[PDB]
């Protein structure tokens, strides 16, 4: 009558995550600075569910997972639903790897975010950017996504296509596709990825976007580790207009006993529209962090960082293009905790 | 202190369900056709919770359940909450069956939807219809519902009443009740059901609605199976106006080893307002489907279907009445998967 | 190979709760009376998750929990998310007690609500009130909160500070802090609590608020129990204006075998603005209830009550201040059930 792991058809998994996070804004509205600014909590804890199933008439193993969103972020109300995060189904054989339908990370985004949005670099390197149309999607519903196996312990591919933000609501024909690749090499790992976005409606124009990324990551027998990337973003409006913007992000780490120190930098460079540059569309961030390996399963950290954002641009409709900078330059000290089970 | 089934006071249950689904619209706006049209995923996976409890001072066994909504449907955003689907409490004795309070299916709806909205027929036979007021509720909050036992292996009753869509928000005095019945007979099963809806506010008129259904269902020793129904809908405005509309839905099936083939048809007939018919308020759908019994616990399927919808009508306020047809005629090929645990 | 309690890193806990609840409104719009009025179900069931963790490098035990909102209340739509209720992380040592970051009850609110909003008294004693600004927060995101241990079996402190309703969305600089205290004494328990609220934006003024509470609670060897409180609320606008309002709430109980009878009363008194009283800003409620201890884990109850609310006031902008009375005087009979696991 007792239970085993085999009694259940699902696993609960969770990621408990809290960050007390103080911000000092410097947008040059003294008022706006206090709203945005100050301390908040940022609970990005969440729960999920997943399981396998060996169907009796299909050798590829069935897989499914349903992850809840963040329960009470900062700048946010409480509560969140099941499947705001990685929710999907799929299959897996050892020979061809796996494929997932639904709501996953794009293969481009998985690198933009990790390792290269950590820590605090997201504002600039993730959704920061001044480019038109859509540089890439991130987590996206309506996606199919192949993850190849590790070919001869070195080479891996992340391939995916899916529907757009609008089209998954039947309010557009926006689509996209993307591919990434990863080459393990001694202590290195080479990352390259791509993602084209088509029929994007924005500023009263249709946009095709293309984004390319190269980067590298190292882990060394002595405790030094690092990551670095260059991202390039093109885009083209249906009225002829071209835009270009490139960025980067870099991270240096020292690890020692139960500790890890981390400096990160990232930046988008001035933006080009039709050969002419747009002065002060630069963004950058510097960041620093101490982290403590408080349990095999958890970490504490303390963190400071500084965003200096762009001084703004119009989109193609003669009206301000929203950027991770429209709220304004801010800095931010935070302590936090994270627990995996 | 190992665990058993008896260690827990709840059960997690899930229904994992994914459907890649391509649509070709033919509304005669070329633009509108692309938005709506195209492929989308349709994750209707969800999770729930439920348990019994034998209260020491009450012989009837306590029952409760909380089912999450669909996590990332088509034409929809991601995420969903606990108790968007069948959420309730109740009790049960073998002599009188069970009763449930909260959010359940109406006894009418349980038949409209099953078997007779499957497969793809829902657009027409479920929420499709041109009639005024409210034909029936479906899943409804604020409901009490009795499910009688199987009297002498043949006769069963589904009985229920509850509050309206408005009244459960304290913005109305809408109410309703409904009853169904089921008679098992050799290889057949006779279904009849009813549902009256009162004080419904709509088109600046209060409406009383009455809807009646008869149908049948057969399973044969040789692998043929089928279902058929006629649904009749009356409604009456508080300004005198009458409306009538009838429908039907039929399903033929062949099953064989691990396979099941399925043709379905359904249709609402032109609508009558005060004796005069409204030409082209007809809707129909034809649908076909192969399904494969991929595990005791799961099925794969492939499916095609064609909706031809009504060409539109006004409500009693001289302004378009919304119908499952306002977006327009479309067809749709889909593959999907479904897993129960 | 089997599982134990120690196999999991989380616990599922739930509170299943249903209340059929009929209301007869008497606002003197005959229409309004029916909308609001009538029966509804009130499912306040919900689910949560929580767990401890003994980090290898930190003696204080890690604690976390994530509680879902109410699944289908009355006057409400269905569904709710994970972490609409008490969601947090924290730590605990026996010497200093515990601390929690996130979304918790304020230390003031925990007493306002319990024991002194039960049963039905909430309308008047919880969010009822006519005072300006914000008397107190209740459940609040972005809060840190210390719960001291029980010092020498008598003395306990609940201390907390957090951000405002706006500021947790970066749309304000509202903050607050609060402290309660509890002295066990023979069969009594003395409660006192406090909560100041700062920079509250409302009626085109900034408000500082201060709210003070004293109360008492008794349990007697013979089956009688009771509670009582007096709550005092000051507030001060940034345009000079002062307001004052005091309230109370009292509860008498007899318990016997498996039964408990309960009379409750509560009331807010007329409100003072700048020394002058606002006639008929009084609110009160009387309530009665029988409850049956149907299982170690659950209760049934039946309940009647009567709210007589204020006849209305303006805020400082010459426009109606919302109160738990704007909808109007109502009474209400209800039966319900509650199950803990």
TrEMBL record, chains A, B, C:
Domain Porin span(s) in chain numbering: 1-310
Recorded topology in the membrane: Multi-pass membrane protein
Annotated keywords: Membrane, Metal-binding, Signal
CDD domains reported for this sequence: gram_neg_porins (cd00342)
GO biological process, alphabetically ordered: monoatomic ion transmembrane transport
Record-linked Pfam families: Porin_4
Primary residence: membrane
UniProt superkingdom: Bacteria
Database matches in InterPro entries: Gram-neg_bact_OMP, Gram_neg_porin_domain, Porin_dom_sf, Porin_Gram-ve
Gene Ontology MF: a single term: metal ion binding
Subcellular locations according to the entry: Cell outer membrane
GO cellular component: cell outer membrane
Ligand binding (Mg(2+)): 140, 165
Alphabetical list of PANTHER family matching this protein: OUTER MEMBRANE PORIN F-RELATED, PROTEIN YDDL-RELATED
Protein's name according to its UniProt entry: Chitoporin
Protein source organism: Vibrio harveyi
């Amino acid at each position: 009558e007792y239970l085993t792991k085999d009694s259940f058809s699902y696993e609960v998994y969770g990621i408990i995550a809290m960050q007390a996070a103080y911000r000092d804004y410097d947008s040059g509205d003294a008022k706006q600075d206090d709203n945005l600014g100050g301390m908040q909590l940022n609970n990005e804890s969440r729960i999920g569910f997943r399981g396998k199933k060996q169907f009796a008439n299909f050798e590829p193993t069935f897989i499914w997972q349903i992850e809840g969103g963040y329960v009470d972020p900062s700048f946010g109300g409480e509560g969140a639903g099941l499947g705001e995060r990685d929710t999907f189904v799929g299959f897996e054989s050892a020979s061809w790897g796996q494929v997932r339908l639904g709501r996953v990370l794009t293969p481009m985004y998985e690198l933009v975010d990790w390792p290269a949005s950590n820590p605090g670099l997201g504002d600039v390197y993730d959704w920061g950017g001044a480019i038109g149309g859509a540089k890439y999607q991130d987590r996206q519903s309506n996606t199919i996504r192949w993850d190849s196996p590790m070919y001869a312990d070195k080479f891996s591919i992340d391939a995916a296509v899916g529907a757009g933000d609008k089209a998954g609501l039947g309010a557009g024909d926006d689509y996209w596709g993307g591919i990434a690749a990863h080459y393990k090499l001694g202590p290195l790992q080479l990352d390259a990825a791509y993602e084209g976005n088509r029929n994007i409606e924005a500023e009263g124009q249709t946009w095709e976007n293309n984004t390319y990324l190269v980067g590298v990551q190292g882990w060394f027998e002595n405790g030094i580790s690092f990551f670095a990337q260059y991202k390039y973003m093109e885009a083209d409006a249906s009225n002829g207009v071209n835009e270009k913007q490139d960025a980067m992000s870099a991270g240096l780490m020292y690890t020692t006993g139960d500790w890890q120190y981390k400096l990160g930098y990232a930046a988008n460079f001035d933006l080009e529209r039709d050969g002419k540059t747009l002065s002060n569309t630069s963004d950058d961030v510097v960041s620093a962090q101490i982290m403590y390996f408080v349990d095999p399963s958890a970490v504490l950290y303390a963190r400071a960082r500084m965003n200096d954002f762009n001084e703004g641009l119009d989109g193609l409709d003669d009206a301000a293009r929203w950027t991770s900078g429209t709220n304004g330059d801010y800095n931010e000290y935070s302590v936090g905790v994270e627990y995996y089970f």
